[PDB]
């Protein structure tokens, strides 16, 4: 009944969903081991075993044994069924070839088997939430091995995807443009929706709105935790118009290949600001389309706004939305698309945005996850492609990528298929006449 498996793969995705599974333990009464001292609601994320223990549905993978081990030597060891927490034996070493053709062709079986077990324990499987990277070896190569093998098995069932994309210039890897382009060669054809974020824009988002300077990767992950808790808000606690995983996969994706939406959170706020600001439905809706709150660090002013979906959480009076979402259309600075006049989707849950203790997101009574399929991401792809042309022209960082079981010709294939995505995203920039 309304269930989904969350495969948190890669060293990025395990710590992305590190605070997500903490956050689902705050919404439901799940304790740090799993007990309540309720109802149907704890079904999409946690299971139920016997006594009253709620085993989650997570397939935490890291091909190196360093970070998952702290999940299984930490203060939530009892919570996760220890089969779920799966490590490897040695890393992927920022190598698409290592994470996909050698180290990983070993962890593949056990990982796939775990999903068969977590799926045959469900009756309402509606989608696969996979959280990975695009730059690291596990988050580019091993998640590609999952995405391709998930298709011959379970199949056309939705495969929603959250990942931290290569930031424009502010980057913590070197060879990361090599891994990202090869990922898209094996993620365009399989991932139904591939909801995007990077690291950069969130630092700014908790630099001006939250005045918490010098943010770390745990602040940077809890905000993604509130993103996924409002996207999966309707496979849970009830309310007004409710959106399942299939909704986003017909209303946020124009054409087959063009399936890279952009996710923003509206109520990015601290304790002192929220005391001095009544976040009504009006301004919470406008703040989404402001071009510094996009979590991708692009200029949406440059691009079209093809497909858009606005989620809601809390005291959201229906009327307010229609009015608010209309103001957004009238404004000509919010530039739109005439090959789809409609453009917009609404969804309202009644569960208020939960607040994680030891956090900085103040308790707010309303929230928006503004999922936008804009084409301003083609500019981010264009800066990720010339970032690769001036390296492959003189064959830098190739010797690790080829000795490890990957044909040299895949660099050309990934290159020319990625330039197709640029042309496809420009064919959907031309006004129809």
């Amino acid at each position: 009944m309304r269930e989904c498996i969350s495969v948190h793969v890669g060293q990025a995705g395990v710590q992305i969903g590190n605070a997500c599974w903490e956050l689902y333990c705050l919404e439901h009464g799940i304790q740090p081991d799993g007990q309540m001292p309720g109802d149907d609601s704890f079904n999409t994320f946690f299971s139920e075993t016997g006594a009253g223990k709620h085993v989650p549905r997570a397939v935490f993978v890291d091909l190196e044994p360093t970070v998952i081990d702290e999940v299984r030597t930490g203060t939530y060891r009892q919570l996760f069924h220890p089969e779920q927490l799966i490590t490897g034996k040695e890393d992927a070493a920022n190598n698409y070839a290592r994470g996909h053709y050698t180290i990983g062709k070993e962890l593949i079986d056990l990982v796939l088997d775990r999903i068969r077990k977590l799926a045959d324990q469900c009756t309402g499987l509606q989608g696969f939430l996979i959280f990975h990277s695009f730059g690291g070896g596990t988050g580019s190569g091993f998640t590609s091995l999952l995405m391709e093998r998930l298709s011959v098995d379970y199949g056309k069932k939705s495969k929603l995807e959250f990942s931290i994309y290569p930031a424009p210039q502010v980057s913590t890897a070197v060879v990361e443009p090599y891994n990202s382009i090869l990922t898209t060669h094996t993620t365009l054809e399989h991932s139904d929706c591939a909801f995007m974020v990077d690291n950069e824009a969130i630092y700014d988002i908790c630099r001006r709105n939250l005045d918490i300077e010098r943010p770390t990767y745990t602040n940077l992950n809890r905000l993604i935790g509130q993103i996924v808790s409002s996207i999966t808000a309707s496979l849970r606690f009830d309310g007004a118009l409710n959106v399942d995983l299939t909704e986003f996969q017909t209303n946020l994706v124009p054409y087959p290949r063009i399936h890279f939406p952009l996710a923003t959170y509206a109520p990015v706020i601290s304790a002192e600001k929220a005391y001095h600001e009544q976040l009504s439905v009006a301004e919470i809706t406008n703040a989404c389309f402001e071009p510094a709150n996009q979590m991708v660090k692009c200029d949406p002013r440059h691009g079209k706004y093809m497909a858009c979906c606005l989620l809601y959480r809390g005291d959201v009076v229906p009327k307010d939305v229609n009015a608010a979402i209309a103001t957004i259309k009238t404004k000509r600075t919010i530039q739109f698309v005439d090959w789809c006049p409609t453009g917009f989707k609404v969804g309202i849950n009644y569960q208020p945005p939960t607040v994680v203790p030891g956090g900085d997101l103040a308790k707010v009574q309303r929230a928006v996850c503004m999922l936008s399929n804009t084409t301003a991401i083609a500019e981010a792809w264009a800066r990720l492609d010339h970032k690769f042309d001036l390296m492959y022209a003189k064959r830098a960082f190739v010797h690790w990528y080829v000795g490890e079981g990957m044909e040299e010709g895949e660099f050309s294939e990934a290159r020319e298929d990625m330039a197709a995505l640029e042309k496809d995203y420009e064919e959907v920039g031309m006004d129809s006449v």
């Binding site: 710590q15 920022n94 210039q169 980057s171 070197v174 060879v175 630092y203």
Partner: protein, 428 residues
């Protein structure tokens, strides 16, 4: 789990590694006997990387102590942390190699290499999933350059899938205390380009600069230098033992760090080095740590990076820090000095964070770089070699044990092939 077989070789190498096991045993909480007595439990969860398991709950090092000269191993076992090593790992012969590459490679050194392979193969095949063999060797002589590269070319064919960390003491420019010093290096770089994957090269001269001037020790003894090089050895394999945020190990710090196969001669550097008078005024925070990394006065190789460009740079940080400040500030030290970096690689950094700070330090970060400025160390040895070889000087020791002048010529030819390789991808 993921372990390292440590490989003290040569007269010098025993003394660096002795200080390596002085700093690691403090970081891992180990007694000078082996009985763990520490505060946290993080220093047991990956204790198996460097230290093995013995009965009585005592941790023995995975260290192979080899030197042709017996005057070092009695010394490392007559010091502070000496009664930890497994006593048959000491694999001494009894003959001085006379700083002769011929003696330590093609002659009497070969007697000891088959015995030291047996010690290594015992400690390498009795372990879960090895990554490689960190080496501290001594390119000024025969127990170093000789026993080193022969061992190194007799590990890369039995185990040809493993990291080959090769922390080297290359000949310092003006600092020189061996008269046949330039021969031993220039005959060894050939056998150190086609086997090793990460040759972090040090000179004594800059370590004399960072100790006497930067850190301001009054009387810099040689043992003070070995604590500095232990930092860049401990801090390069520290996400691999101690936990935290975004990690880095030897293969990570190779793939983003080796542009082309013969481009692995790196150059180290620590960061939170202070003095007595300037420990208490300098505010230890991420801003100050980034600058001393790139400053030429704190740099364990005889080269300002000014005459050249970094092909790639890594930084493996160590401490409780944020992560905006980690890479936004080094983006600042990537764009403010555009000529000092390559343009054919747009972003040039691997970062890392370990949560656990050093012993008595709030943060630290060892810095490794593949600068173009390695070529000057390799220019000067060649210049020193040409003045040597021009009239067949110091050669009757280097020819009476099996070595021909035809092999000498090859050594220089691949030697100045490397300075061309670090010049073809210079300014261009």
């Amino acid at each position: 789990m993921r372990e390292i077989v440590h490989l003290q070789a040569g007269q010098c190498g025993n003394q660096i590694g002795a200080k390596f096991w002085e700093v690691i045993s403090d970081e891992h909480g180990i007694d000078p006997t082996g009985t763990y007595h520490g505060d946290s439990d993080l220093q047991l969860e990956r204790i198996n990387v460097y230290y093995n398991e013995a009965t009585g709950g005592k941790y023995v090092p995975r260290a192979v102590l080899v030197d042709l000269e017996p005057g070092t191993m009695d010394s490392v076992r007559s010091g502070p942390f000496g009664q930890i090593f497994r006593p048959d790992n000491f694999v001494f012969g009894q003959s001085g190699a006379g700083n002769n590459w011929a003696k330590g490679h093609y002659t009497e050194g070969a007697e000891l290499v088959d015995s030291v392979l047996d010690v290594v193969r015992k400690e390498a095949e009795s372990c879960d999933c090895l990554q490689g063999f960190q080496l501290t060797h001594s390119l000024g002589g025969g127990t170093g350059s000789g026993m080193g590269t022969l061992l190194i070319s007799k590990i890369r064919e039995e185990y040809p899938d493993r990291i080959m960390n090769t922390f080297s003491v290359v000949p310092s420019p003006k600092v020189s205390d061996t008269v046949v010093e330039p021969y031993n290096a220039t005959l060894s770089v050939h056998q150190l380009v086609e086997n090793t994957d990460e040759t972090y090269c040090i000179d004594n001269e800059a370590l004399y600069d960072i100790c006497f001037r930067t850190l301001k020790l009054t009387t810099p003894t040689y043992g003070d230098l070995n604590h500095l090089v232990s930092a860049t050895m401990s801090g390069v394999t520290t996400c691999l033992r101690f936990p935290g945020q975004l990690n880095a190990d030897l293969r990570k710090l190779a793939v983003n760090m080796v542009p082309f196969p013969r481009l692995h001669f790196f150059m180290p550097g620590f960061a939170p080095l202070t003095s007595r008078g300037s420990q208490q005024y300098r505010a230890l925070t991420v801003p100050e740590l980034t600058q001393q990394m790139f400053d030429a006065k704190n740099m364990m190789a005889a080269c300002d990076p000014r005459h050249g460009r970094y092909l790639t740079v890594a930084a493996v940080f160590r401490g409780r820090m944020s992560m905006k400040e980690v890479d936004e500030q080094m983006l600042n030290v990537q764009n403010k000095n555009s000529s000092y970096f390559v343009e054919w690689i747009p972003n040039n950094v691997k970062t890392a964070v370990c949560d656990i700070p050093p012993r008595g330090l709030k943060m630290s970060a060892t810095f490794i770089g593949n600068s173009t400025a390695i070529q000057e160390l390799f220019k000067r040895i060649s210049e020193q070699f040409t003045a040597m070889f021009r009239r067949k000087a110091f050669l009757h020791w280097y020819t009476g044990e099996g070595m021909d002048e035809m092999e000498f010529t090859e050594a220089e030819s691949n030697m100045n092939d490397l300075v061309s390789e670090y010049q073809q991808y210079q300014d261009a």
